[PDB]
């Protein structure tokens, strides 16, 4: 049982999100640090900013910056203990898609011979891991002041019983089967990244994609408040 | 009465490598692709001779220890026959992918490697080919055994021979034979090498028709 009489397992309808709270500037030792939580999924993101290349100096590109992303899950995430060394295949992909989304809109043009590292550590996974990681990395980058095209927000969506669902939990990704996560920058409506692993029929596709994008826009209407609230309580202390 | 089974040989299948040789021996099948003279890393810089790498991969499972020993046998046979003093500080890579395993892999692998080194254009002093004999419980030898003849027999010998004076280049063994059986298998291998070396020349004339 997933959705009957319009109500889900968590007790929320098909359109609304989870409760997500993002905090900026955790680790003052680093450059940019963000901690976000979407329901019970905890995500932590650290970016060390545009520092020069320390070793292996042949990697540097002459025109644009280089973006390095590494995804590491905690060993105590789910019930079964999993080991991040010798379990690299799932992670290698999750890092390379982050590399794609943050070479998409980070403006590498302004930083020649520059390395930007984005490290994301997940502390407690409860479904929708990828969207939480992308949102944490976006808040972390906008801490450190790397100038980018647009605020980046990601979410997920499923399709059960003729209705689209937004922001799945672990239960709904477990039994259901249709997952579709996307990363979106809302100033131009351009979908930055798609992920979908399903048996979904073609005639429904557009519908769930709209709902997915709609959920992403709701994320953009929430985190923005946090960012503005944060930057407002910067300026009162300055001038 | 000792004769091989049916041979088929094809050149220039693949586009990207410098040479391509498919070799079908009975039911077994080995495809070999060879990159020509190319760039080396600094660690393998040998000023007299050319580095000659051999990679061998079977189709089931990931490759292991015995395949490493086989590809060392390939690199030593090839560097014995590849005139490698002519090209210093360059690397030649010989890649082998097992298509069909029907018995006597090393013979078909050496034949494919020889045709691939010919068609890629690396200068060599001589041709080389591989054959195999199988000694049963009685002592009747069979040239180029099948998997069932290889399974029943008490000895399997694989010989790579040379084209100038039919000398022994490489030899591998799974068996418990005696020396006179070795001498007879070597003589039968020389006759089989004569047949295969004629088959080389026929296919190399079959290419250059235009």
């Amino acid at each position: 049982l997933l959705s009957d009489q319009g109500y889900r397992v968590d007790g929320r309808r098909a359109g609304e999100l989870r409760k997500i709270q993002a905090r900026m500037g955790v680790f003052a030792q680093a450059d940019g640090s963000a901690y976000i939580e979407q329901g019970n999924t905890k995500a932590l993101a650290v970016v060390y900013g545009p520092h020069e290349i320390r070793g292996s100096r042949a990697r540097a590109l002459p025109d644009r910056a280089l973006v390095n992303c590494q995804y590491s899950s905690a060993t105590f995430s789910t019930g079964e203990r999993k080991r991040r060394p010798h379990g690299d295949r799932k992670s290698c992909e999750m890092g390379l898609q982050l590399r794609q989304t943050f070479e998409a809109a980070i403006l590498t043009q302004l930083h020649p011979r520059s390395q930007i590292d984005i490290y994301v550590q997940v502390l407690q996974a409860d479904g929708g891991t990828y969207a939480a990681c992308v949102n944490a990395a976006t808040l972390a980058v906008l801490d450190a002041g790397i100038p980018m095209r647009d605020f980046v927000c990601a979410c997920s969506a499923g399709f059960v019983d003729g209705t689209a669902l937004a922001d799945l939990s672990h239960v709904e990704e477990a039994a259901g089967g249709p997952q579709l996560a996307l990363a979106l920058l809302p100033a131009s409506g351009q979908i930055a990244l798609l992920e979908m692993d399903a048996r979904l029929h073609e005639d429904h596709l557009e519908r769930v994609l709209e709902a997915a994008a709609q959920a992403a826009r709701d994320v953009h209407t929430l985190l923005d408040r946090v960012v503005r609230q944060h930057v407002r309580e910067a300026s009162i202390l300055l001038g | 009465g000792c004769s091989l089974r049916h041979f088929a040989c094809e050149q220039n299948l693949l586009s990207r490598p410098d040479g391509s040789a498919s070799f079908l021996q009975g039911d077994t099948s080995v495809l070999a692709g060879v990159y020509g003279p190319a760039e080396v890393k600094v660690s393998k810089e040998i000023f007299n001779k050319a580095t000659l790498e051999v990679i061998l991969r079977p189709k089931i499972g990931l490759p292991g220890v015995a395949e490493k020993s086989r590809e060392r046998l390939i690199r030593n046979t090839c560097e014995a026959v590849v005139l490698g003093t002519l090209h210093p500080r360059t690397s030649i890579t010989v890649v082998l992918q097992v298509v069909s395993d029907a018995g006597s892999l090393l013979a078909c692998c050496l034949n494919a490697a020889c045709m691939a080194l010919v068609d890629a254009g690396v200068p060599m002093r001589a041709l080389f080919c591989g054959v195999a004999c199988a000694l049963d419980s009685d002592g009747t030898l069979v040239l180029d055994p099948t998997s069932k003849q290889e399974k029943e027999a008490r000895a399997v010998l694989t010989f790579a021979l040379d084209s100038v004076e039919r000398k022994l280049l490489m030899s591998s063994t799974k068996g418990l034979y005696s020396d006179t059986e070795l001498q007879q298998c070597l003589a039968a291998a020389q006759a089989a090498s004569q047949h295969v070396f004629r088959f080389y020349r026929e296919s190399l004339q079959r290419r250059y028709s235009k």
Binding site: - | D18, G19, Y35, G36, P37, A38, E39, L83, L86, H87, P88, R89, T90, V118, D119, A120, G121, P123, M124, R125, A126, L127, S163, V164, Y200, R201, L204, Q205, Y208
Partner: protein
């Protein structure tokens, strides 16, 4: 009276010994090497003679040979010299004062990633090769930067050795049909340009498809 010079239009195997009759010494071509009083064959091919003996093989990888017309690609620049990819073992070098009419006061306009037509002055086994874009008298006979807006592709060296004979077939028909201009390069590289894109594509297909 066998295997000296009788097979002068046949297909040789690499390694079959042949010798010259008789002081008046001869010069050996690219495939053959010397051994005492005989000549050692290193490649497959058809033997041809002109008064020199030479064999030719349809091979893809180019070896650096002194004094050939080669299209290359600029890799990067390092001070006075800039390096060019040829498609051989090691990339060659160019000096900016080697182009026509250049000194420290006038830099020749060379950008990273532009093709260059020139010829090798030093090319041996011992060192890395170096090329120039100037004649022996001190002028450019069409050497230097080719330019842009013309399709580049890669073919076999045997096709270039067939097409650049004084007796050819395809080039006169192609020049007869419509206007275009092409550049051959002895490492196996063809540059083409026509007035429109469709004729450029048809030219590229007709050139590479034989």
């Amino acid at each position: 009276a066998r295997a000296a010079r009788t097979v002068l239009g046949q297909v040789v195997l690499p390694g079959e010994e042949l010798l010259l009759p008789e002081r008046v010494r001869v010069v050996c071509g690219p495939g053959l090497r010397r051994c005492g009083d005989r000549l050692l064959v290193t490649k497959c091919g058809r033997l041809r003679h002109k008064e020199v003996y030479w064999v030719d093989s349809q091979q893809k990888r180019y070896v650096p040979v002194k004094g050939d017309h080669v299209i290359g690609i600029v890799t990067a620049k390092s001070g006075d010299i800039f390096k060019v990819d040829v498609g051989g073992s090691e990339p060659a070098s160019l000096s900016y004062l080697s182009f026509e009419g250049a000194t420290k006061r006038n830099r020749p306009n060379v950008q990273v990633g532009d093709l260059i037509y020139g010829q090798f002055v030093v090319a041996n086994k011992d060192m890395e090769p170096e090329m120039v874009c100037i004649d022996s008298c001190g002028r450019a006979n069409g050497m230097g930067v080719i330019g842009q807006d013309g399709l580049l592709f890669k073919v076999t060296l045997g096709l270039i050795r067939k097409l650049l004979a004084p007796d050819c077939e395809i080039i006169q028909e192609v020049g007869k049909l419509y206007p275009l201009e092409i550049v051959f390069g002895m490492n196996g590289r063809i540059w083409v340009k026509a007035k429109t894109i469709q004729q450029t594509l048809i030219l590229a297909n007709i050139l590479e498809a034989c």
